[PDB]
Design a protein around this ligand. Structure first.
Ligand code: ATP
Ligand code: ATP
Ligand code: MG
Ligand code: MG
Ligand code: MG
Ligand code: MG
Ligand code: MG
Ligand code: MG
Lengths: 309, 309
């Protein structure tokens, strides 16, 4: 078995380190530049690779800066089998941060237009690659012009393989995944609104209702932790208090760690502790994806989990 | 004869267009991306090329993204003969702007370390290329580790050719150029402080004193225009009022136009009107280098020049 991530809109993140705050209408000299991979699915692959668990990244990348993207992926130990879009470049996301502050300003390019041929190639690739014993994680919003209809086809193609399907998406894409029937979703506190019943005020009740259609339902609540519904049980997960530096990417780390736990057949409570420990470590870091495996293994032991009756 | 520009720290400018103001600690989606050349000397070359006047750009560029830089230069009709630094990349300067606002936030990378071999190659190149009937314009601060001593050697090498030498530099580099003896400098209102005599309060008097050592002295004053000293005369140059959008690069356009005027043997007052007209047109534009040759030719006719007795 293996875990596949699907990144429909990959990116190359260029971290621009400056001194102090980012002042608009002013000159902000860059002290140093670092690179990381962009696209939620790739971040999830990076997390899985840190665990050493077998995984492969799928998606559509631009031909013009393919060597650069691949070089970054090798630095992250991410194995891949990307489809390539000729005459285009994988988008670049500029992330401005400082060793003096906690924030991060993100300036992302939108992404390119995927050809129908490549949309079709991805489906054929999934059909021949993915087996029922595998796990597939789709994360991140589709690139421009990759319609709801296209996403529906993608979800259906994955469902036909019998593989476990997890989706960390938002808006209409998240709504569709839930309607279609997926195994796992992790909307954060704001994203979950898209699938909430307006006439049902209680968040717990809404979660218990949605749990009827989703095997592993996680609603993440930032520093408050998360609430997870599984096998008719509801868990309130609380992380230990950590010194936050940058909570960007905390969700991607949570998803990667959660999936890793499931892949290793860890009981749901342990999987939740591992995911929470890893994401807590992430928030302690400057960038938007890194985390300390050492700190996480300890933090996992300081996560409280209480079943809500 | 020909005009040579020297850009010791070239760059590739990536213009990132967003909606509204650049909000720090927030996500600022890029609507579109455009490219331009960076490095003051290259901007001056771009201006000269718009005039159709013969010119060639010199300097040291990185090998790793040379094709990209050259592609941009061809788009600007800039002829060049750059030295190349192996294993390095020409720095990228990120410029965030919007069709909704007037500002521009600049996030520039510092530049690479030039090898002694290339510092020496530039001097040998200048010695064999430049003739006494030529004009040489050095603009922009040197890259990291390109010392005052290195700059002194550069200025001396240019002086030995007999060519006209113009310098649009600041700080210690500007001070050195003046001490060394150059034909033209254009410090703006803030930069001129570096060469002012603290015990001499009057700006006019300071300019008249410095004019003893500089044939063509221009102190630019932004929207107020400029003051130029030449052949024992002092000129107050006032531009027509224009709707400012982005005054970044107004100085580079002024320098390119001023040099073009001198190359065409235009009387000093006409040269000043042309430079002022072009820079006024530049300030009306969004980016940091473009200007309308059509608007400038008209604006030039609405520039007032009064001799200060
Ligand atoms: N300040 C914090 N302290 C401890 N843990 C945190 C903090 N912020 C986030 N986390 C952990 O990370 C998980 C990821 O969470 P959040 O709900 O912010 O995800 P998200 O907003 O989707 O993330 P992303 O930025 O990747 O989209 C949380 O449920 C939590 O366990
Ligand atoms: N608001 C304006 N209206 C009309 N003309 C202007 C305006 N701002 C600048 N200029 C013109 O452009 C010339 C270039 O000027 P300024 O003194 O700002 O240069 P600078 O700050 O060195 O430029 P740069 O941004 O290239 O470094 C001015 O002397 C003036 O003639
Ligand atoms: Mg994405
Ligand atoms: Mg969050
Ligand atoms: Mg998220
Ligand atoms: Mg420069
Ligand atoms: Mg100015
Ligand atoms: Mg200037």
């Amino acid at each position: 078995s293996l875990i596949y991530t699907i990144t429909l809109n990959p990116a190359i993140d260029r971290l621009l380190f400056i001194r102090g705050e980012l002042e608009k209408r002013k000159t902000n000299r860059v002290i140093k530049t670092e690179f990381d991979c962009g696209g939620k699915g790739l971040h999830v692959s990076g997390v899985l690779s840190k665990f050493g668990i077998k995984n492969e990244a799928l998606g559509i990348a631009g031909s013009d800066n393919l060597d650069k993207l691949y070089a970054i992926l090798k630095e992250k130990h991410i194995n891949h089998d990307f489809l390539v879009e000729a005459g285009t470049s994988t988008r670049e996301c500029f992330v401005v941060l400082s060793d003096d502050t906690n924030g991060s300003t993100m300036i992302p390019e939108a992404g390119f237009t995927v050809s129908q041929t490549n949309k079709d190639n991805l489906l054929k690739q999934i059909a021949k690659k993915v087996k029922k014993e595998d796990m597939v994680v789709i994360a991140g919003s589709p690139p421009p012009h990759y319609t709801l209809s296209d996403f529906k086809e993608l979800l259906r193609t994955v469902k036909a393989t019998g593989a476990f399907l997890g989706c960390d998406n938002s808006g209409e894409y998240l709504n569709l995944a839930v309607e279609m029937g997926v195994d796992f979703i992790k909307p954060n506190e704001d994203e979950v609104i898209a699938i909430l019943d307006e006439k049902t005020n209680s968040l717990e009740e809404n979660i218990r209702t949605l749990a009827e259609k989703i095997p592993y339902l996680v609603v993440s609540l930032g520093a408050k932790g998360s609430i997870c519904a599984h096998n008719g049980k509801l868990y309130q997960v609380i992380p230990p208090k950590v010194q936050e530096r940058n909570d960007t990417g905390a969700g991607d780390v949570f998803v990667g760690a959660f999936i890793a736990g499931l892949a290793m057949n860890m009981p749901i409570t342990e999987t939740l502790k591992v995911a929470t420990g890893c994401s807590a470590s992430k928030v302690m870091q400057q960038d938007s994806s890194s985390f300390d495996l050492e700190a996480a293994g300890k933090l996992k032991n300081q996560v409280s989990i209480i079943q809500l009756e």
